[PDB]
Design brief:
- The structure is cut from a larger assembly and holds chains A and B.
- By secondary structure, chain A is of the alpha/beta class.
- Helices cover 29% and strands 15% of the residues of chain A.
- Chain A has 31 helices and 34 strands.
- In chain A, the strands form nine sheets. A six-stranded mixed β-barrel of chain A has the order 1-5-2-4-3-6. Chain A has a six-stranded mixed sheet with strand order 13-17-14-16-15-18.
- The longest helix of chain A has 26 residues.
- Chain A is globular.
- In chain B, strands 1-2 form a two-stranded parallel sheet.
- The longest helix of chain B is centred in the middle third of the chain and has 17 residues.
- Chain B is flat and about 50 Å long.
- Chain B starts with a helix and ends with a helix.
- The chains are: A alpha/beta, B alpha+beta.
- Chains A and B meet through helix 19 of A and helix 1 and helix 3 of B.
- The structure holds adenosine-5'-triphosphate (ATP) (2 copies) and magnesium ion (2 copies).
- The site of one adenosine-5'-triphosphate has 12 residues of chain A, from helix 23, helix 27 and helix 28.
- One adenosine-5'-triphosphate (ATP) binds next to helix 12 of chain A.
């Protein structure tokens, strides 16, 4: 509900107070004090999370009104205040008590508390200082305690709740941090820092634009006339009180150009805006393009002057989002609506924004003319999603007039007259956004330090026009391509265009292409591009033309296809190349952007007509940290959920723990992650919504749901060859268990640059070729290190993915190493190299009908290995007799690394016990050492086969115990029947609780469980590891 | 279809046999070159996914879609690659008790 909002200078922790009507109607006597919730009229689409409030009766307050302590929000009497709120009483009175709170305090009072000998002295002094009362005090994280001096950091479990001094654990913090000086409430500032002056000519000061529109009910002075925000402008009372007006009735503006007329309004305290500017709708900033930033004027121009235009011409500004044929009906309709709905003020040489809903094709609604209002209700079931400019000429005003620069249009009198083109520069996004104001599906945004190649493309386009045209012309063409196929490369253009104010045309010739049959539809494609562009390219001042998916059109030439079709390809290639230059003849300053998903398929016959190309890689850690910040920022996460309850993350999120551990190689579409989380978080919210113990009144994301989401995203893509980073537990890189473990870390610690920022260009990498423990271990070993000192395990799966097809399979090697390197930091596991089994040309593959894997692997990954960065090998060879030793040598991939199998003296017996753990051994004695009754040289993975046999023996014991219980089940059932029901309906715990007490690991071991290997083959490995494996 | 869908508010679409509209031919051999990744049907599928994705990002309440088919993998590559699909189910040969109720 809405209630009248008012303020007091009372302390932040004092109770609010409510008008007698609210107190009598909603003061439930089951509670000593009425709890409630507040929200304010925040600007824009979002909303603040509803803040709990505590209140008391006051019969003096006007009907349906609230007083709140100004310092709760940080308001001050130095500026005009708000007047109404969203409120609710907390029905059912239940409110959570916080598990803990953290406080941060200046050094003086911090030390004065920390040196106190007892807890209650600290508590009571805090109570005195801040008027905090146990149980009753409402608190939120980031709440102020005193500006300059102390603040409330965080709360648990919820970010808001009640404090109990006996059970809310109190955490007290100081660090002398200068951030205390940044505590300034919402205001604390002496305005006389601009000293008073008796008169001024124009008060020229910076003009800027809002991040959003302003809802009409916010318009505090509320002029009675129905009139348009498009004429309104908004700023503080500061500077306004330096004029001789408030809520100014008449303002006019010019900045070394034409004049605009505007109306002024005051912005209120809750904003986070600049301390000094005027904020305007973009309708202003369509004038003064990218400049003209500072000058205004105010005078009594008139209350109802300029009331007509006898004739005008109004114009399409033109643009691909405008000039295409099928949108015309709705744009013209909403255009006439813009003039029909009210009188409005216009200037000569002036721009009106108009927006519409796409996909309104075929649907015409307002078939009946006039009648009762309907357009506005559709206009609130609509919400706009594409935006275009219309331009109006000067009015042909009758007779002589001193006013010759501005005019009013209204539904009566003169009609709209359309005219062909009026070319105009699109606004640069850094001067003012537009999408944000209209809340459209938003062009992503960059900071130019972290992404290189956006800066590259920017530097191309920014120079080729504006900075060039002072001199001789220069066209440009660029091709964009990427190894990975979802990299967002099209979105790059959507960005850079708006960033540089480049007028964009974009072409969906991927499929919107008529008959388009490559092998038949002869030339229609070329007509489709040419005749389309020709109708819209002329009289666009800059121009970039962007084609999606050139692989739809261009293709290679091969023996496999009809020469007739090949000559069709030839014709299309040639005419495309000619039209590409023809734009450079007919339409000066045109620039061309191509995009291709696989660079090889465009023949060099076209590729020669590049001016540049860019490899766009998959992003890396610093980029991913930026990109998650985007998706989890408030306004983009919210705007599409129409549900009134807002959504947010909470700042305990670890963007760094996402950035790598959670993100690996993942091929963008992090969107999929954030949406998967948003669903799951919403589910638990609607779960508790079933009148459960509390309702935190906001959807709150949590790290656990991000972890679940990312792990799901690695397996829902079930075809994916990859693997997660953490297949390892209890085995976290125990570098002290043996010397060899003490040396695996060398190959990772060094390229982690901890010894130096290595040159990436001298010493060959100490990649490891692991004999290790030859019999068993290797399956674990690489995974164990990979999780605990590295970051992924995407691995070559070495036996698979050799393509049989003629001359193809080099593609799979080049792809696998590309996909490996595409994750910056982590190894590839390689099985036995017998997965490749390179074997020098004889007694096998014989190097003839197959060479394609090894003939690549000898080279390209060794090139990377010699630059010695990012990616590392950890192969697990056992049978070098099967291999050619063209690798496995000091010249390429050295460090033939051996460990052997421990003879009998092992801590690994203790670690065997430690991993039979997680399941109970009832004995007090550990009884492990009797396993050493095994004859020596035995210590293989069969340790855990023996734990399996012991567990199965416990299972057999409990199985025969339940069989005995079944046999006597007549003791509690009329028959020894229904066993499959009985165990479930009795279920007296006893849930397979483990019985390792029977020590049956020896009872297995004494059988000489022959899956162990102990033969001379082990001696063979043990000797040859030294004799040849070194 | 999309035009009607946006009109009727919260709405749902199904396609009883998606294989006919958007099944990639299983032979993987419509052309030997890379453009086998964009035969005519897959071209339709991409157009559809683009339209839907664009309207969906405006307001997720408005349209969902159900695809019924033969084998969850065998529909189409692009359908998974773009993360258009997600939450999923399958029917299984009914158990004896339900089998009795059916009979
Ligand atoms: N790094 C990113 N930054 C911003 N938006 C991104 C990013 N990665 C993906 N997206 C979003 O995903 C979509 C990417 O579409 P786009 O056409 O640019 O590429 P794609 O479809 O993955 O590739 P292709 O052009 O090869 O078909 C857009 O909606 C874009 O906003
Ligand atoms: N040194 C060890 N300490 C403890 N457990 C070990 C050890 N070596 C092997 N194991 C057991 O065996 C697993 C790792 O070795 P495993 O028997 O799986 O290798 P493998 O299959 O012979 O290896 P490869 O990949 O070379 O074929 C571990 O998960 C553990 O159960
Ligand atoms: Mg794309
Ligand atoms: Mg193994």
């Amino acid at each position: 509900m809405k209630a009248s909002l008012t303020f007091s200078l009372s302390g932040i922790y004092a109770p609010c107070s409510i008008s007698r009507d609210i107190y009598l109607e909603y003061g439930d006597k089951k509670a000593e004090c009425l709890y409630g919730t507040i929200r304010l009229p925040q600007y824009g689409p979002g909303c603040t999370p509803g803040k709990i409030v505590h209140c008391v009766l006051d019969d003096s307050l006007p009907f349906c009104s609230i007083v709140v302590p100004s310092k709760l929000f940080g308001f001050m009497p130095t500026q005009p205040t708000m007047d109404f709120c969203y409120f609710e009483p907390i029905l059912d009175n239940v409110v959570p008590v916080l598990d803990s709170v953290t406080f941060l305090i200046n050094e003086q009072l911090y030390s004065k508390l920390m040196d106190l000998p007892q807890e209650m002295q600290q508590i009571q002094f805090l109570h005195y200082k801040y008027n905090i009362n146990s149980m009753e005090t409402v608190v939120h994280s980031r709440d102020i305690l005193t500006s300059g001096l102390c603040q409330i950091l965080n709360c648990s479990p919820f970010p808001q709740g009640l404090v109990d001094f006996t059970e809310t654990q109190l955490i007290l913090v100081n660090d002398t941090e200068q951030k205390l000086s940044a505590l300034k409430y919402a205001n604390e500032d002496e305005e006389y820092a601009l000293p008073k002056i008796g008169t001024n000519s124009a008060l020229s000061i910076d003009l800027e634009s809002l991040p959003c529109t302003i809802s009409r009910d916010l318009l505090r002075p509320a002029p009675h006339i129905n009139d348009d925000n498009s004429i309104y402008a908004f700023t503080d009372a500061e500077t306004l009180l330096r004029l001789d007006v408030t809520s100014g009735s008449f303002i006019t503006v010019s900045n070394m150009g034409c004049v605009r007329l505007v109306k002024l309004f005051v912005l209120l305290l809750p904003n986070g805006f600049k301390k000094r500017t005027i904020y305007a709708p973009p309708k202003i900033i369509a004038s003064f393009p990218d400049c003209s930033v500072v000058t205004i004027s105010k005078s009594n121009i008139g209350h109802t002057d300029i009331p007509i235009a006898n004739q005008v011409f109004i114009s399409r500004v033109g643009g691909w989002l405008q000039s295409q044929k099928c949108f015309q009906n709705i744009i013209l309709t909403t255009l006439k609506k813009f003039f029909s709905e009210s009188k409005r003020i216009l200037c000569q040489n002036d721009l009106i924004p108009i927006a519409f809903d796409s996909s309104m094709a075929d649907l015409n609604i307002a078939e009946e003319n006039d009648e009762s209002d309907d357009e506005d209700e559709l206009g609130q079931y609509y919400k706009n999603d594409s935006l275009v400019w219309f331009f109006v000429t000067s009015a042909e005003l009758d007779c002589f007039s001193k006013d010759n620069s501005h005019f009013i249009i209204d539904p009566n009198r003169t009609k709209l007259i359309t005219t062909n083109i009026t070319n105009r520069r699109p606004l640069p996004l850094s001067r003012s956004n537009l999408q944000r104001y209209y809340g459209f599906a938003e062009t992503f945004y960059y900071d130019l330090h972290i992404f290189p190649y956006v800066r590259q493309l920017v530097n191309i386009l920014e120079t080729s026009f504006n900075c060039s045209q002072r001199g001789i012309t220069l066209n440009a063409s660029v091709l964009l391509h990427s190894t990975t196929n979802n990299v967002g490369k099209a979105t790059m253009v959507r960005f850079a265009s708006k960033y540089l104010g480049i007028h964009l045309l974009e072409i969906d010739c991927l499929s919107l292409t008529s008959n388009s049959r490559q092998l038949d539809s002869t030339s229609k494609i070329i007509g489709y591009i040419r005749a389309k562009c020709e109708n819209v390219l002329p009289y666009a001042s800059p121009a970039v033309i962007f084609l999606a998916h050139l692989d739809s059109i261009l293709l290679d030439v091969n023996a496999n296809q009809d020469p007739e079709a090949i000559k069709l390809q030839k014709s299309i290639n040639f005419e495309m190349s000619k039209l590409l230059d023809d734009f450079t003849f007919k339409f000066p300053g045109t620039t061309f952007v191509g995009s291709v998903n696989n660079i090889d398929n465009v023949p060099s016959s076209f590729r020669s007509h590049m001016r540049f190309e860019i490899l766009v890689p998959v992003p890396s850690e610093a980029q991913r940290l930026r990109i998650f910040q985007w998706y989890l920022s408030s306004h983009e996460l919210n705007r599409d959920v129409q549900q009134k309850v807002p959504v947010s993350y909470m700042d305990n999120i670890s963007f760094s723990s996402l950035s790598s551990y959670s993100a690996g190689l993942t091929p963008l579409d992090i969107k999929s992650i954030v949406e998967t989380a948003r669903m799951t978080a919403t589910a638990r919210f609607y779960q508790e919504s079933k009148k459960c113990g509390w309702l935190p009144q906001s959807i709150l994301i949590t790290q656990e749901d991000l972890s679940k989401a990312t792990s799901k995203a690695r397996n829902e893509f079930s075809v994916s060859i990859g693997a997660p980073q953490i297949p390892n537990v209890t085995w976290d890189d125990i570098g002290g268990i043996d010397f060899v473990k003490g040396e695996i870390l060398d190959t990772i610690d060094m390229p982690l640059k901890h010894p130096e920022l290595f040159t990436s260009g001298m010493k060959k990498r100490s990649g490891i070729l692991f004999y290790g423990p030859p019999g068993t271990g290797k399956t674990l070993m690489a995974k164990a290190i990979a999780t605990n000192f590295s970051l992924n395990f995407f691995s070559v799966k070495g036996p698979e993915l050799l393509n049989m097809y003629i001359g193809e399979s080099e593609a799979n090697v080049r792809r696998v190493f590309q996909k490996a390197r595409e994750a910056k930091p982590c190894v590839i596991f390689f099985d036995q190299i017998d997965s490749v089994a390179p074997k020098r040309g004889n007694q096998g593959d014989s190097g003839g009908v197959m060479d394609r894997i090894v003939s690549q692997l000898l080279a390209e990954l060794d090139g990377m290995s010699t630059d010695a960065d990012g990616v590392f090998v950890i192969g697990a060879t056992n049978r070098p007799d099967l291999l050619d030793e063209a690798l496995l040598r000091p010249g390429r991939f050295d460090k033939l690394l051996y460990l052997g199998i421990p003879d009998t003296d092992t801590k690994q017996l203790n670690i065997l016990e430690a991993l039979t753990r997680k399941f109970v051994l009832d004995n007090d004695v550990k009884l492990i050492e009797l396993a050493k009754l095994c004859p020596f040289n035995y210590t293989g993975a069969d340790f855990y086969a023996l734990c399996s046999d012991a567990m199965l023996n416990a299972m057999s014991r409990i199985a025969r115990m339940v069989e005995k219980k079944v046999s006597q089940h007549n003791e509690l059932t009329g028959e020894n029947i229904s066993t499959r029901r009985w165990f479930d309906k009795i279920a007296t715990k006893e849930d397979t609780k483990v019985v390792v007490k029977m020590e049956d690991f020896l009872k297995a071991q004494e059988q000489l469980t022959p899956s162990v290997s102990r033969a001379e083959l082990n001696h063979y490995e043990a000797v040859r590891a030294n004799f040849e494996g070194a | 279809w999309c035009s009607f869908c946006y009109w009727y508010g919260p709405s749902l679409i199904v396609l009883d046999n998606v294989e006919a509209l958007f099944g990639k031919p299983q032979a993987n051999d419509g052309d030997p070159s890379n453009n086998g990744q964009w035969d005519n049907a897959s071209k339709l599928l991409n157009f559809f996914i683009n339209q839907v994705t664009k309207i969906f990002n405006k307001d997720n309440k408005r349209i969902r879609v159900l695809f019924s088919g033969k084998q969850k993998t065998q529909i189409n590559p692009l359908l998974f690659d773009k993360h258009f699909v997600s939450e999923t189910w399958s029917l299984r040969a009914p158990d004896k008790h339900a089998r009795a109720k059916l009979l």
